[PDB]
Amino acid sequence: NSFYSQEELKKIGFLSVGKNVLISKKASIYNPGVISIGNNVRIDDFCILSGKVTIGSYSHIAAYTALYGGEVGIEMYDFANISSRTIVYAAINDFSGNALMGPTIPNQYKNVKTGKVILKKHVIIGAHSIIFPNVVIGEGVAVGAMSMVKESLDDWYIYVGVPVRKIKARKRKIVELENEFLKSMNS
Amino acid sequence: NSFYSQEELKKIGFLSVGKNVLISKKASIYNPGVISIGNNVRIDDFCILSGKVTIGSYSHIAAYTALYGGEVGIEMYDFANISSRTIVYAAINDFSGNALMGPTIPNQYKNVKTGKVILKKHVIIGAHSIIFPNVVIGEGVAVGAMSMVKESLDDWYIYVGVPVRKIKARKRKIVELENEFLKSM
Amino acid sequence: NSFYSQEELKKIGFLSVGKNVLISKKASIYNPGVISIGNNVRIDDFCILSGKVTIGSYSHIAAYTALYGGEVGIEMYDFANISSRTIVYAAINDFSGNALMGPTIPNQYKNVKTGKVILKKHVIIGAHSIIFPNVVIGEGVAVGAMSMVKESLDDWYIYVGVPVRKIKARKRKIVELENEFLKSM
Numbered sequence A: 001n002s003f004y005s006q007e008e009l010k011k012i013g014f015l016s017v018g019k020n021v022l023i024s025k026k027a028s029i030y031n032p033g034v035i036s037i038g039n040n041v042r043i044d045d046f047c048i049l050s051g052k053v054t055i056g057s058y059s060h061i062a063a064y065t066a067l068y069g070g071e072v073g074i075e076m077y078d079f080a081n082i083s084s085r086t087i088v089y090a091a092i093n094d095f096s097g098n099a100l101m102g103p104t105i106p107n108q109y110k111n112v113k114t115g116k117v118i119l120k121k122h123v124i125i126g127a128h129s130i131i132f133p134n135v136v137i138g139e140g141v142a143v144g145a146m147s148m149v150k151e152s153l154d155d156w157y158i159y160v161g162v163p164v165r166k167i168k169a170r171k172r173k174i175v176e177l178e179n180e181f182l183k184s185m186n187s
Numbered sequence B, C: 001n002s003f004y005s006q007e008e009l010k011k012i013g014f015l016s017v018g019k020n021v022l023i024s025k026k027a028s029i030y031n032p033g034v035i036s037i038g039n040n041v042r043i044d045d046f047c048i049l050s051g052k053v054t055i056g057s058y059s060h061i062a063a064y065t066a067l068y069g070g071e072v073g074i075e076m077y078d079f080a081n082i083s084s085r086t087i088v089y090a091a092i093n094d095f096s097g098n099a100l101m102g103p104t105i106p107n108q109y110k111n112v113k114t115g116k117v118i119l120k121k122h123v124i125i126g127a128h129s130i131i132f133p134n135v136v137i138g139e140g141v142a143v144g145a146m147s148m149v150k151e152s153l154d155d156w157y158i159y160v161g162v163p164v165r166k167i168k169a170r171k172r173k174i175v176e177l178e179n180e181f182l183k184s185m
């Protein structure tokens, strides 16, 4: 394995880091100062966390995943997971041609769309997917592999495609299993 | 370039690693102990090889490619190649809502689907593709870029889309070139 | 941030490299002697530039992006930007079954398709996209996320899909702004 030690970790300088947080040494963490991580979290190789990013507990950010929180930030609630090679954007430039583009160029010439991105509890994003700014992913939502998400998504559904369409209900058993797991944790 | 010396290879300790095997120091190899590698194989920057993976000979695995063989294994026969940024999964979690998810939770609470992934000879996988567990990709199968493969695939066909659909037969002239090529050695 | 200093850049040995140039140390650069960079370029972690590549000025190459310039080359012009996880190939292997495949194999048995690739001014390439060889992406072209490009694209259009299709005109307003920005300089 490739993860930082508890020793190495406290030395990163996160706004917050819980316990049993496993982080690849091969990930990239920009501005840990604005990054909070709960407990039981895994962040694999070649991830990039940048800007404002909050992660709860029980979350795997699989390899190659980029979270660009910029300023408004990205929030994951507990039991959210993100599969490989996913990108989440809290800010994006305007593609229309009404705006010059990117970090090379002064702000006034651009027309950056920005907006908090939220992943609620039990959201799972499949591999190679893309989430855009200002998007709340509803509790329980499953998004398929190679998905593109530009708009908010209603609780407890499964979505696929570019851009995603609602294809079926997500089952809630998962909520019973969460309840059980916490109780095994209990007494 | 960015490859191991033949020297340093030996110091990784694969189940087995043949000759003329170029593997980027920028790859991530986990649990080399269950990975074997034949001859004339290139693995490029930022690849990941995890768990049980078996690569024959004359195979390129291109940059960013993730092979997660876990316990059941991925296996690739000779002259099989994978283009950049592919993921081969020998194990996936249940997305239905019937299970809790990922490596952060106990296995009683989950419903991991698992099953060996094999790519037969002369298989080519296009870039940005995803092969899920329990899939035999038949000999001479070509899968297009940006494709997703959840079921086994018939021999000598070209497949594309998400999930893939069969679009036409692959030419087999490469059988000849294999023969003619092995010949001259 | 993971960038080289003005200093270390000079040691890399780029054909040419201008000012305000930030390249990630996490990037891989092969054969930097055929690679050339204007001014006010940014190249992010995990990018790969390989063989012949030429970038003008005011361009961002975002993270994970692979540019395989080969011998023919890839050229971007001023104000072209490329989003994350893109790949641009100036050379590719033939999938049809008429040839054997990849770098593990002698040229005489392959059937490499190759040709210069060009991104004209103001091109924007969407995240997770692929550009095949021998194409010109028209001036002012935007190509959506997760799109695949196999042919030259007409100027001032937005294209999406796999492979792309034209969906609407790109506003030419950016020309005004390019002037206004450059005037102000």
Ligand SMILES: CC(C)(COP(=O)(O)OP(=O)(O)OC[C@H]1O[C@@H](n2cnc3c(N)ncnc32)[C@H](O)[C@@H]1OP(=O)(O)O)[C@@H](O)C(=O)NCCC(=O)NCCS
Binding pocket: A083, A084, A125, A126, A127, A143, A144, A145, A146, A147, A158, A159, A160, A161, A162, A167, B089, B091, B092, B093, B095, B096, B148, B162, B163
């Ligand atoms: C989304 C997913 C869970 C749905 O699978 P399913 O519930 O078994 O449903 P089906 O395969 O029958 O597909 C239903 C429909 O959506 C389409 N579809 C399925 N997955 C799709 C995807 N990823 N993108 C686009 N369309 C998809 C199918 O073509 C089918 O279409 P139709 O009914 O119009 O013919 C699964 O296909 C998937 O993408 N899983 C992602 C796995 C992953 O990323 N894992 C990381 C490892 S833990």
Ligand SMILES: CC(C)(COP(=O)(O)OP(=O)(O)OC[C@H]1O[C@@H](n2cnc3c(N)ncnc32)[C@H](O)[C@@H]1OP(=O)(O)O)[C@@H](O)C(=O)NCCC(=O)NCCS
Binding pocket: B083, B084, B125, B126, B127, B143, B144, B145, B146, B147, B158, B159, B160, B161, B167, C089, C091, C092, C093, C095, C096, C148, C162, C163
């Ligand atoms: C698979 C591939 C070879 C097929 O293309 P081809 O044999 O030239 O055939 P065509 O381009 O005429 O395509 C036939 C149909 O498939 C579709 N198609 C082709 N490639 C597709 C892909 N990757 N995904 C979805 N559809 C695809 C076309 O839209 C066309 O559709 P239609 O029948 O509805 O019109 C090619 O497009 C591809 O994906 N190559 C991948 C190369 C790669 O990843 N290289 C790595 C560097 S070596």
Ligand SMILES: CC(C)(COP(=O)(O)OP(=O)(O)OC[C@H]1O[C@@H](n2cnc3c(N)ncnc32)[C@H](O)[C@@H]1OP(=O)(O)O)[C@@H](O)C(=O)NCCC(=O)NCCS
Binding pocket: A089, A091, A092, A093, A095, A096, A148, A162, A163, C083, C084, C125, C126, C127, C128, C143, C144, C145, C146, C147, C158, C159, C160, C161, C162, C167
């Ligand atoms: C291409 C893009 C600009 C178009 O957005 P838009 O101008 O708002 O257009 P719409 O969302 O109305 O969609 C227009 C049509 O294109 C389709 N479409 C949009 N984006 C698509 C994509 N990336 N791939 C395939 N189809 C797409 C829509 O389904 C719609 O189809 P219809 O007219 O048949 O219903 C945007 O969808 C996109 O892909 N942006 C990429 C952003 C990125 O990669 N950013 C990097 C960080 S700065």
Ligand SMILES: Cc1cn([C@H]2C[C@H](O)[C@@H](COP(=O)(O)OP(=O)(O)O)O2)c(=O)[nH]c1=O
Binding pocket: A001, A002, A003, A024, A043, A044, A045, A063, B030, B048, B050, B051, B068, B103
């Ligand atoms: C994928 C990955 C694995 N590893 C290590 C830690 C794991 O114990 C081991 C197995 O990899 P992985 O495929 O994540 O296995 P699992 O699904 O069993 O957790 O390899 C890393 O250090 N970094 C990574 O990015």
Ligand SMILES: Cc1cn([C@H]2C[C@H](O)[C@@H](COP(=O)(O)OP(=O)(O)O)O2)c(=O)[nH]c1=O
Binding pocket: B001, B002, B003, B024, B044, B045, B063, C030, C048, C050, C051, C068, C069, C070, C103
């Ligand atoms: C792509 C890549 C190339 N290289 C080096 C070794 C290759 O011989 C050289 C050129 O590779 P590449 O650009 O892929 O060219 P080709 O397709 O002809 O093999 O750069 C690496 O070390 N690591 C890599 O991940």
Ligand SMILES: Cc1cn([C@H]2C[C@H](O)[C@@H](COP(=O)(O)OP(=O)(O)O)O2)c(=O)[nH]c1=O
Binding pocket: A030, A048, A050, A051, A068, A070, A103, C001, C002, C003, C024, C043, C044, C045, C046, C063
């Ligand atoms: C993505 C990325 C960021 N960084 C650093 C430099 C940036 O100033 C910072 C975050 O940049 P970014 O998230 O791209 O946004 P902005 O356009 O607001 O700068 O982190 C790197 O060094 N390499 C990278 O690949």
Ligand SMILES: [Cl-]
Binding pocket: A064, A085, B064, B085, C064, C085
């Ligand atoms: Cl990637």
